[PDB]
Amino acid sequence: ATSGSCKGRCFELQEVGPPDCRCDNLCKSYSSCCHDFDELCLKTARGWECTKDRCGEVRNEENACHCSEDCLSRGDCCTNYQVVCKGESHWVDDDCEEIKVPECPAGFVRPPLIIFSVDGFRASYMKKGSKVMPNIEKLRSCGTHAPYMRPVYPTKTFPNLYTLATGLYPESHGIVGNSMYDPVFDASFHLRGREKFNHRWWGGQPLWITATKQGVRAGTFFWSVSIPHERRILTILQWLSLPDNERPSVYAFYSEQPDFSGHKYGPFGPEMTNPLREIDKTVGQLMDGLKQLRLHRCVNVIFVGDHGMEDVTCDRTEFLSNYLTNVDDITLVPGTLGRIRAKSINNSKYDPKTIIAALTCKKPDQHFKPYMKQHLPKRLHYANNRRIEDIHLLVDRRWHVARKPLDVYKCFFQGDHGFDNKVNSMQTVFVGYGPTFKYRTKVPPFENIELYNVMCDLLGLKPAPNNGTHGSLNHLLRTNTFRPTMPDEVSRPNYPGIMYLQSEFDLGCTCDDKVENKLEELNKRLHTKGSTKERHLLYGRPAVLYRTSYDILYHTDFESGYSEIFLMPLWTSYTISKQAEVSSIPEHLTNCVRPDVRVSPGFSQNCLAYKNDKQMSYGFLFPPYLSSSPEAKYDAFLVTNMVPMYPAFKRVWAYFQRVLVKKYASERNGVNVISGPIFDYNYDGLRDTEDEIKQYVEGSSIPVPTHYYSIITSCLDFTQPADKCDGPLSVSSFILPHRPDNDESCNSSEDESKWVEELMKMHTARVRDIEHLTGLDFYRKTSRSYSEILTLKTYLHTYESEI
Ligand SMILES: *[C@@H]1O[C@H](CO)[C@@H](O[C@@H]2O[C@H](CO)[C@@H](O[C@@H]3O[C@H](CO[C@H]4O[C@H](CO[C@H]5O[C@H](CO)[C@@H](O)[C@H](O)[C@@H]5O)[C@@H](O)[C@H](O[C@H]5O[C@H](CO)[C@@H](O)[C@H](O)[C@@H]5O[C@H]5O[C@H](CO)[C@@H](O)[C@H](O)[C@@H]5O)[C@@H]4O)[C@@H](O)[C@H](O[C@H]4O[C@H](CO)[C@@H](O)[C@H](O)[C@@H]4O[C@H]4O[C@H](CO)[C@@H](O)[C@H](O)[C@@H]4O)[C@@H]3O)[C@H](O)[C@H]2NC(C)=O)[C@H](O)[C@H]1NC(C)=O
Ligand SMILES: CS(=O)(=O)c1cc(Cl)cc(COC(=O)N2CC[C@@H]3CN(C(=O)c4ccc5[nH]nnc5c4)C[C@@H]3CC2)c1
Ligand SMILES: [Ca+2]
Ligand SMILES: [Cl-]
Ligand SMILES: [Cl-]
Ligand SMILES: [Cl-]
Ligand code: NA
Ligand SMILES: [Zn+2]
Missing domain, CATH: 4.10.410.20 (Factor Xa Inhibitor)
Structure with a gap:
């Protein structure tokens, strides 16, 4: 009614x-x-701007806004009132003055927060549209900005807007696409329709709920498309005039542009200048409005985008009907990503293995790649949700995927988004301006999942649990609310000595090692006691943050943390200087594996299991090829340095170890490497407990890793060697899937120099991702501040070309 x-x-x-x-x-x-x-709420009479004649007018309640003398008190002047009638200036025209402290009206308990979000605002618009965006450029250069902000995957509207609000990956907050099907609800979420309004889709806890639950009032975050932007600004300005006990502390404004035009004209279509002009005018209205309410040196403003925009056209569409004979038995969520599931949910005939095989490397210039969702790069965090179909297609930038030609022809668009979130055109924007943000400060690019913690900080809220790393963006803020602290180590290591005789071992392992002093025997003794450890463990031992039993094992060339539960290192650490030399595994040591006299037969692997498992071979965490001497090389063949590897994977690993490590050491002036296994059988991005492991080397208790990681650190100033670095560090990491084939790599039949590094780059990762997956905590002992270390741990090396 x-x-x-x-x-x-x-x-x-x-x-x-x-x-x-x-x-x-x-x-x-x-x-x-x-x-x-x-009639009452959506007035439009006389437009949105004052004119000289309208000055001092008599109040007419039918106007969209007012230029009467009483307007400032009522809180409903046109935003340009003071400029036109009182000889004031526009906010953009004033010089940039540092906001050292909040300058708020009486009754304001805290600086308000205004989140100005812009849809499809590609990062490079800040430079390329600077001439036509004076208000935005002022915010950017006077406040705190990043060159770009990285969205989440898929680089879609809803998943990104809701990620900004919650600090969660789409897989956790539930909005995994702009459209999705939930097999338990048996219902579809669409941009059009009522389904999207049901609360059951929306997980996590968004900023507005967080605010409310802690006594902080929120304006609304959603705006009907039929409410013009001018009216949105005036409403926020009106709300800011409410009594103390009624006034929200956090506000949101949303713009459908430039996304709307970008889809029609492409990211840099000549038609794009005008929407950029218009967003800017809107920002100018907001800032003029705040300057009227004497709040322009009181409010913190966030100008933030959800994702970028790419050139995409109808003719650049791959059709599944070109690869699959049975295109009618599948449902495809199409576009800039592909998600495939059975047309009929309960049929045993549907084999996803054959679907994938039919989509794998079938055309030489194929513009997408199919994955089982658990095999997608871990950095995408796109698997742990029932709304994510088992089959995923990662589509090339500039391209679309569709099911049949008819879906597409029965071409009106030149731009789209949704691709891999490392893609340059998908990058978007961040500017922070206000008393709490820093003054004229550029910060490095960061991920949008980090913003929820900052907004909570800006509002004095305790953030709900989220995927940000709290403290990693403290360097955006003039005054911090949160002091991060290193987590306490849960398990302390054992430091075992020589306790077992060779003959106590029945591992089925052999080696040609029976050939051999005062000088070289007391010296190798120091190596096993930790003498070269200051060289190979450069940032302290990683802390183990869960309950377990493990040993620190020292050697001349490397140090490891050996798990007696998993029968292999959780981590192996070693430094390769720029002058280090690669050698080969000598012919008589090719099948060499030696018992480790510090570790019981009971907590060791055996060579027999690997003999009997025809699928599974083994490799080593510290590489024999990088041994400092023939004597030291024997250490690399310890049964405690050994990890299970598919022969298909050994090709990848051996190339990384034999060739890439040395190359990185040359280019970065030495590198420190920490490598180890990852077990994530339920693809939740977190370390598996021992009873969650789904696969073992056949007939053994040796678990098989799902992934292998490495963290490769050096000095940021490369004129200093990695092992003698005084300043900031530089890191790149990866998490390689441990797969029994190389189907992922279409050129894998060629030499490793043509494909391995490309695969590794695809599976680049943050140290922070590896921490979740191992339960380890790295960089415990450096000369750097912990906040700077947190930033370092959230860094991702993307390998894209310069923005
Ligand atoms: C990124 O950040 C997020 C957030 O920090 C990380 O995700 C968290 O990770 C935890 C580990 O997976 C997980 O803990 C679960 O929680 C189970 C209950 O979860 C429900 O309630 C959650 C809390 O909401 C409350 O919030 C405040 C807190 O004060 C309260 O005031 C409110 O009143 C609320 O109650 C809620 O977040 C969660 O939401 C999920 O599910 C909803 C639908 O039901 C979705 O709408 C929503 O989007 C969420 O969906 C995601 O998460 C689920 C898993 O929860 C996942 O399956 C989806 O795909 C999607 O990803 C729920 O509503 C709790 O029961 C669990 O406890 C089990 O395990 C422990 C382990 O020790 C046992 O002790 C315990 O006995 C229990 O086992 C029992 O159950 C087993 C399975 O049924 C059974 O086999 C066994 O025998 C036992 O009976 C566990 O604690 C968090 O829920 C999760 N939070 C979120 C938001 O996802 C994430 O890991 C980060 N990512 C990375 C890579 O780092
Ligand atoms: C960043 S914040 O302030 O926390 C914040 C969080 C959330 Cl969840 C929503 C907000 C603010 O949202 C809102 O007002 N909404 C209302 C409009 C909706 C209807 N939309 C589309 O039809 C649409 C747009 C672009 C597309 N490209 N490709 N397909 C597309 C489809 C967009 C939706 C955004 C949500 C802000
Ligand atoms: Ca797991
Ligand atoms: Cl292979
Ligand atoms: Cl465990
Ligand atoms: Cl760019
Ligand atoms: Na084998
Ligand atoms: Zn869009």
Whole structure:
């Protein structure tokens, strides 16, 4: 019954549900507005700007906004009122003055936060559109900015907007696409329709709920498309004029541009200048408005995008009907990513192995690649949700994927987004301006999952649990609310000595090692006691953050943390100087594996299991090829340095170890390497407990890793060697999937120099990702501040060309 009125209720802040009619900014979307809503709340008379004649006018309540003398008190002047009528200046015209402290009106308990979000605002617009965006350029250069901010995958609207609000990966918050099907709900989420309004889709805890639960009032974050931007600004300005006990502390403004035009004209279509002009004018209105309310040196403003925009056209579409004979037995979620599932959910005939095989490397210039979702690069964090189909297609930038030619022809678009989140055109923007942000400061690029913690900080809230790393963006803020602290080590290591005789071992292992002093025997003794450890463990031992039993093992060339539960190192650490030399495994040592006299037969692997497992071979965490001497090389063949490896994977690993490590050491002036196994059988991005392992080397208790990681650190100033670095560090990491084939790599039949490094780059990772997956904590002992270390751990080396 939409029988009531909006008289004196325009844009009320507490949503009253039907039968009674609504007057809030979402009533339109719910089709529940009072009949006078447009009349009372959506006035448009005389436009949005004051004119010289309108100055000092007599108040007419039918105007969109007012230029009467009483307007400042009422809180509803046109944003340009003071400029036109009182000889004031526009906010953009004033010089940039540092905001050393909040300058707020009496009654303001804390600086308000305004989140100005812009849809499809590609990172490079800041430079390429600078001439036409003066208000935005002022915010950017006077406040705190990043060259770009990295969105989450898929680089879609809803997943990214909701990630900004929650600090969660789409897989955790549930909005895994702009459209999705949930097999338990048996329902589809679409941009059009009512399904999207049901609360069951939306997980996690968004900023507005966090604020509310802790006594902080929020304006609405959603705006009906039919409410013009001018009216959105005026409403926020009106809300900011409310009494102390009624006024929100956090606000949000949303713009459908430049996304809307970008899809039609491409990211840099000549038609794109005008929407950039218009976003800027809107920002100018907001800032003029705040300057009227004397809040422009009081409010913190975030100008943030959800994702970028890429050139994409109808002709650049791959069709599945070109690869698959049985295209009618599948459903495809199409576009800039592909998700495939059975047409009929309960049929045993559907074999996803054969679907993938048919999609794998079939055309030489194929513009997508199929994955089982658990095999996608771990950095995408796109697997742990039932709404994510088992089959995924990663589509090349500039391209689309569709099921059949008919879906596409029965071409109106030149731009789209959704691709891999490391892709340059998908990068978006961040600017922070206000008393709490830093003054004229550029910060390095960061991921959007980190922003939720900052917004909570800006508002004095305790953030719900999320995927940000709290403290990693403290360097954006003039004054911090949160002091990060290293987590306490849970398990302390054992430091075992020589306790077992060779003959106590029945491993089925052999080696040609029976050939051999005062000088060289007391010296190798120091190596096993930790003498070269200051060289090979450069940032302290990683802390183990869960309950387990493990040994620190020292050697001349490397140090490891050996798990007696998993029968292999959790981590192996070693430094390769720029002058280090690669050698080969001597002919008589090719099948050499030696018992480790510090570790019991009971907590060791055996060579017999590997003999009997025809699928599984083994490799070594510290590489024999990088031994410092023939005597030291024997250490590399210890049974405690050994890890299970598919022969297909050994090709990757051997090339990394034999060739790439030395190359990185040359280019970066030495590198420190920490390598180890990862077990993530339920693809949740977190370390598996021992009873979750789904695969063992056949007939043994040796678990098989799902992935192998390395963290490769050196000095940021490369004129200093990795092992003698005084300043900031530089890191790149990866998490390689441990797969029994190389189907992922279409050129894998060629030499490793043509494909291995490309594969590794694809599977680049943050140290922080590896921490979740191992339960380890790295960089415990450096000369660097912990906040700078947190930033370092969230760094991702993307290998894209310069933005
Ligand atoms: C990124 O960050 C996020 C957030 O920090 C990380 O995700 C967290 O990771 C935890 C480990 O997986 C997980 O812990 C679970 O929680 C189970 C209950 O979860 C429900 O309630 C959650 C809390 O909401 C409350 O919030 C505040 C807190 O004060 C309260 O005031 C409120 O009143 C709320 O109650 C809620 O977040 C969660 O939401 C998920 O599910 C919803 C649908 O039901 C979705 O709408 C929503 O999007 C979430 O969906 C995600 O998460 C689920 C897993 O929860 C996942 O399957 C989806 O795909 C999607 O990813 C729920 O509503 C709790 O029962 C679990 O406890 C089990 O394990 C422990 C382990 O020790 C046992 O002790 C315990 O006995 C229990 O085992 C029992 O159950 C087993 C399975 O049924 C059974 O086999 C066994 O025998 C036992 O009976 C466990 O603690 C968090 O829920 C999760 N949080 C979120 C938001 O996802 C994430 O890991 C980070 N990512 C990375 C890579 O780092
Ligand atoms: C960043 S924040 O302030 O926390 C924040 C979080 C959230 Cl969840 C929503 C907000 C603010 O959202 C809102 O007002 N919404 C209302 C409009 C919706 C309808 N949309 C589309 O039809 C659409 C747009 C672009 C596309 N490209 N390709 N397909 C597309 C489809 C966009 C939606 C955004 C949400 C802000
Ligand atoms: Ca796991
Ligand atoms: Cl192979
Ligand atoms: Cl465990
Ligand atoms: Cl670019
Ligand atoms: Na074998
Ligand atoms: Zn879009």
